[PDB]
Amino acid sequence: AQSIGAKLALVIKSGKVVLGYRSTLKALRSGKAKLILIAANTPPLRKSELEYYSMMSKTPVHHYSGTNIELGTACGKLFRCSTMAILDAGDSDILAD
């Protein structure tokens, strides 16, 4: 919650992430994703599609409390983002909880 902004910035610095909807689905198909984030105002049909893929590949999903505008800013970018995947956690412990 409060510390997600802190943990997310660390994964950006050390680990590797993938941004967007088309790439997130490709990551889930390969089976190498460990954690996905879904923004608050994503369309409900898309939101249910992402969650069903996660159930198939057994990866946890965390529901971000902000819009697509501030999910992008939390990643240090200058553009909106509605969903993302994490391929590896670096010096961060975001996978622990």
Partner 1 sequence: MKFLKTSRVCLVTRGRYAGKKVVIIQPVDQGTKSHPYGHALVAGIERYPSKITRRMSKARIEKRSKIKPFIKVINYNHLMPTRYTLELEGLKAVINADTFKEPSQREEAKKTVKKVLEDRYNSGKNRWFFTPLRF
Partner 2 sequence: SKRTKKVGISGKYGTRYGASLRKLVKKQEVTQHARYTCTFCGKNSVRRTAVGIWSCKSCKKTMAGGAYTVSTPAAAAMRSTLRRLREITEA
Partner 3 sequence: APTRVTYRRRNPYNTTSNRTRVIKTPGGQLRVLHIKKRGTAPKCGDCGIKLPGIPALRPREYATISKPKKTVQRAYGGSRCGNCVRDRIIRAFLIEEQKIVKKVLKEQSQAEK
Using CB under 8 A, list all residues that contact partner 2: 41, 43, 67-69, 80
With CA atoms as reference, report the closest residue to 33 among 18, 12, 45, 48: 18
Choose among partner 3, partner 1, partner 2, none what residue 48 binds, the Cβ cut-off being 5 to 8 Å by kind.
partner 3
**What is the C-alpha R_g of the chain?**
12
Strands of the 35-38 sheet, one edge to the other: 16-19, 83-88, 35-38, 61-63
Confirm or reject binding of residue 95 to partner 1 (CB under 8 A): no
Q: How far is the CB of 23 from partner 1 (least distance, A)?
A: 12
Residue ranges binding partner 3 (CB under 8 A)? 45, 48-49, 52
